């Protein structure tokens, strides 16, 4: 493929300042499987000598469906951390369901389930309704702002907080950590420690389940979490179901400023088929790993026993093969078979429909309170190689 030599398709300066679209359109048309090669302390803590970018929507779903041979425990999923980490805070993410295989990761998976029954979802819906109606109003009074602050970064924190049933006077210190729980090399960021806010977060939840959905997570049914497990759980959806709805309502509100017509068939119908095109779009995480358990081949390349393997989703949810005209936000996709959630299999998106119903109440509460917003200035990215961030955004709310 035509691609400078060394290039990274995890590496954190390319993401700092773009997403490398090119790049993997070029990789799809000329090498949908390939070999990128990352030299000694440059593996973003990995020094098995780099991993195989998978770029194509099957191959990733082909990888996802067979977590028998595809293992998430192995090296865990994130294919990116700063250079010099140590490899015991690599293996310490085992502790969460992401980073677990069958059988431990089935049987929490099945208790962690109570929590994201459709009836708990839909039970927050009328509580985030009037809290994304609010935001709304609150940013439209402001004038102009940060939007990533004023409108996508409350309403995914209260969407946990409220599924949690955490008390209002805990949500303040609940919210600080999970702001500081995901893992960057931002240098906005650099004095953030995401192990004391894990430690103290891990022990807030223990003291929430000891005084004890948490209950019904920690009622035996004789299974149930401990309570050490119930705050590996809570730790887990910091990182899952925080950063990644803020960043698809940052992108989402980027995308409807770039296609004008596409925000105003938005406010006439709001239709159904947006929020899966905004998380298309946004593709929040834009790449999670595997290792082989053993040889495997796929779509004609021979992947081999311990080798790492980079789903990417921000080039499958392009993939020309699938989508018509993926270059182009059509609020009304259909169909839209997107890997933003992931490849359907053991670890799909437990929160992807608490995710669609935070998406929807937001932007309903902009097209209703804010229909004429404009940008101000040009987002500022985040510096990471597999989330795909958006730190600050200024726009005018009133236009
Ligand atoms: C647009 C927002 C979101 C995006 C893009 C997203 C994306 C993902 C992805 C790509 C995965 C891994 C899937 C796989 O490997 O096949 C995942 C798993 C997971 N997500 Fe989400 N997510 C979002 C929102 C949420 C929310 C709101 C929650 C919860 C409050 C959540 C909870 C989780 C959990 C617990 C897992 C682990 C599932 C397992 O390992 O069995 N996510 N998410």
Redesign the pocket.
Known sequence: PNLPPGFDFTDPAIYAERLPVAEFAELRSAAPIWWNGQDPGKGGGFHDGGFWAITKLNDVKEI?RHSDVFSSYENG?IPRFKNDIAREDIEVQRFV??NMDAPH?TRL?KI?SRGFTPRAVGRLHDELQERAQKIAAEAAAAGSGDFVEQVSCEL?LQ??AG?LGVPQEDRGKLFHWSNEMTGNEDPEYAHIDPKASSAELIGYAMKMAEEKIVTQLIQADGEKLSDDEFGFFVV??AV??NE??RN?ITQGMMAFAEHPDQWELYKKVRPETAADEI?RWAT??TA?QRTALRDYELSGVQIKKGQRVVMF?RSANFDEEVFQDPFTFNILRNPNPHV????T????????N??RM?INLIFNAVADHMPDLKPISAPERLRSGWLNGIKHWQVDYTG
């Open positions: 996802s999923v369901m992401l990761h998976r962690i995914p969407a946990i599924l887990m959806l899952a179901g990644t709805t698809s998380v929040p995480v999670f989703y933003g959630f992931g490849g299999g053991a670890h799909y998106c437990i929160g992807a608490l995710a935070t």
